[PDB]
Design a protein around this ligand. Sequence first.
Ligand SMILES: Cc1cn([C@H]2C[C@H](O)[C@@H](COP(=O)(O)OP(=O)(O)OP(=O)(O)O)O2)c(=O)[nH]c1=O
Ligand SMILES: [Ca+2]
Ligand SMILES: [Ca+2]
Ligand SMILES: [Ca+2]
Ligand SMILES: [Cl-]
Ligand code: NA
Ligand code: NA
Ligand code: NA
Ligand code: NA
Length: 893
Amino acid sequence: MKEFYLTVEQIGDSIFERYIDSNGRERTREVEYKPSLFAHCPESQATKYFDIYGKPCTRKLFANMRDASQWIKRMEDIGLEALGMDDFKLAYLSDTYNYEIKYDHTKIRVANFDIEVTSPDGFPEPSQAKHPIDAITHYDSIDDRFYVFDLLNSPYGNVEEWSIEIAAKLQEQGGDEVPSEIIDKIIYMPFDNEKELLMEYLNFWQQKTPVILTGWNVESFAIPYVYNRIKNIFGESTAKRLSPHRKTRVREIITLFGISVLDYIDLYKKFSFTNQPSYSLDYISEFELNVGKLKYDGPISKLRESNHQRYISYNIIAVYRVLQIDAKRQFINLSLDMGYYAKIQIQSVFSPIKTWDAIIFNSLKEQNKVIPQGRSHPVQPYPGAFVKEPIPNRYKYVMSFDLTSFYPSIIRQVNISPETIAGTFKVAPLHDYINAVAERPSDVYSCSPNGMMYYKDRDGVVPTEITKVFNQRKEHKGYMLAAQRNGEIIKEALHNPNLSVDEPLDVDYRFDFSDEIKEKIKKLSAKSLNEMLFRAQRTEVAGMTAQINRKLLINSLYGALGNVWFRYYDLRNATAITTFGQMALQWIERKVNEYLNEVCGTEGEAFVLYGDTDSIYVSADKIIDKVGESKFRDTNHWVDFLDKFARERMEPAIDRGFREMCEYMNNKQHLMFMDREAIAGPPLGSKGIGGFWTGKKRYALNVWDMEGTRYAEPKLKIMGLETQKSSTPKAVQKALKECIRRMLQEGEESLQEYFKEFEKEFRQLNYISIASVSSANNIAKYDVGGFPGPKCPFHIRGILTYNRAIKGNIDAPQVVEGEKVYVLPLREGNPFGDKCIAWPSGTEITDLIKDDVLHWMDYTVLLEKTFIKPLEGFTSAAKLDYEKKASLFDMFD
DNA sequence: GCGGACTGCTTACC
Ligand SMILES: Cc1cn([C@H]2C[C@H](O)[C@@H](COP(=O)(O)OP(=O)(O)OP(=O)(O)O)O2)c(=O)[nH]c1=O
Ligand SMILES: [Ca+2]
Ligand SMILES: [Ca+2]
Ligand SMILES: [Ca+2]
Ligand SMILES: [Cl-]
Ligand code: NA
Ligand code: NA
Ligand code: NA
Ligand code: NA
């Protein structure tokens, strides 16, 4: 097979590389790499090297990497540009792997681990590592085995061996319910001393050295704890065995040279597109996998002592949970894909700037072109997208339209790149271009309304490389949408399931079901169908991960143009994109309004009610009215009608409008592709209002079709409202959403019934479910003798109240700076001495003060502040009442 | 005694 790297590092004048060879074997080599950099040279000098602007350069070979970096400094002292890739390991990878890397993931050692540390005096600080490590579970992807290291003898208690027989038993049998599919994969090792455990773990590590190292919070806890514990016990030289090159670099984070650490919490935060109230593994596992919380009696600091059996079982389970989350989300696969595509260290996938620098560098190197030197720039603001101010109101029938990959398509259309800049023109006010009254900027170059002109013959490296990734994105989105469409087919077949014993069909959910498959589905059992729906949704999530993160990468290339740390930073190019974007949106709003007035036979009516960046929301009341609501059989009938109308009439008109804009700006290629997104409206013959807007970025719609996916049941599309915010209490989100569902689908009366019921019963809701959530930043900034300082935020005040309440209890959970907290208001005269209290999110509040918090919660404040105020906002906007008003009719019986 | 204007903070939407 073709060779591929695993890890690369620079240590002095040496490049240390771990790699898989042509026979599939892992090897390590130290290479005294000789890098090249470039300097501008006279035009009369024969060379094959040119910078991106076409100026000739000469290549300077250096005896070692130190001589190259010293030359860079000297060139700085002279005042001349030192060109070329200054990150020598990226240069090394590019030289060593001068082809498209095809890798075999089964050859890559991915290690998932988690440690346990009993601490009687609070959270065990990794920098101190003063407590024994009493458990390590380490899963190896190559062995497919869970290696379990169990400390039997500790100063905090001597325990019996963990029993795999009991671990496998059901909870109802007094077992631990360790999943049956990993029982035979567990390799259990008890130890009588901590030193012997750690020594063996190091020997194990040497034999099975991770390439990718992951787990939950491994970078901030597990890795530094293990490193510091081993260092404190055996000495630094022994601790350095954690690095395959014996080099490490040190609240601290340890860099293990020759290992690529991908902490799963960081992968999840970057790639999941969620914002969670808590990031405990417990919480995320429940959210992602729908598994129950790992229950136990007493505190964690005594779990090993009281129930060591469960203690070890939960350690193993914790490792497995991350594997299960990755099997669903596939962020490891994404990191490997992106990393090898860019030819970077795998951990550099967290940095889109490093990623794009490497992609562009490799692309330019292929043509013997030389990259410019990074330069220092001051941070400056620059304008972004346009957002229309909507008239707050209900909106019955709505169709939306969105542009495909907007900013990257602008880049490709206008041909925006550092080296395709051609000149400038004199700008007219933006609305002059929008209304097509300003003179055509250029009949030679491709232009943006910010004043920039670009060559339209030349291939730009930014357009070229963004197109390649965009093409990957488009493929994966197709798989995602098909899996989604396949999902609805299965959901509708769950309305008439057969009573028989069969099996789920063997199909590729990435492609639309054939008629044969669909026929078989209608005769399938409920058990088989539910299993198919599961596999369909899993296939959809896999596609979603792949497509939405390639979308993120290409949008981050736009973003990088506005980042001073980017080698190709240029506010001329960044603004060219956003300004063109503002023009395109407002241009097509006009075209859409014009076309719809023409087909509806009216004049001057506003059809576009809202728009943000690249989307428009079209009021379709008059389209429905022209055909008359009476002529429709059911809801699905008018949905098909609007689907057809948008597809056969509106979209061709939109394409005509954009083609004209492309000619207006003399652009290189028409790539403004705006298709229908959502069809929204109330159920036919209902009192539902269909949708409403309260303001910019705040609306709700009752959607029947989304991007070609015809829902089995109508799905609420809610943006910006409190239902969508992690800060809103769980039970309030749920209640507010039901309020919205009733408004959009059923009407005012239905809303009023539900509200009355909620108000009556809400005090019985669990305290966690009605707690607000907030991030805890700068606690110390507002701490004045344990009391709130000037301008102390509400949630920070709650934390200070908590701290005073648990003062003198070394066992009580501490609020961690930067993490999230649950927040509850307190009734007047409470023993806590303040109007609110906060505690670490994702946890029960400590038993020390739990009963008193429950007693003093302010349900009245909770209701009117988190529930009623947002509800008042929704309903006044939609022009209705959540509560029956007083009338002259009240004087009757 | 507190409404309005302004500020910091948080978390959305694109
Ligand atoms: C979501 C997002 C958008 N944007 C900008 C660039 C996007 O092209 C533009 C439009 O937002 P989107 O319409 O949400 O994203 P998109 O048009 O790029 O991709 P899609 O085909 O799924 O619609 O907003 C960012 O800069 N960063 C982001 O994270
Ligand atoms: Ca021993
Ligand atoms: Ca879009
Ligand atoms: Ca059937
Ligand atoms: Cl796409
Ligand atoms: Na742990
Ligand atoms: Na059970
Ligand atoms: Na130490
Ligand atoms: Na779309």
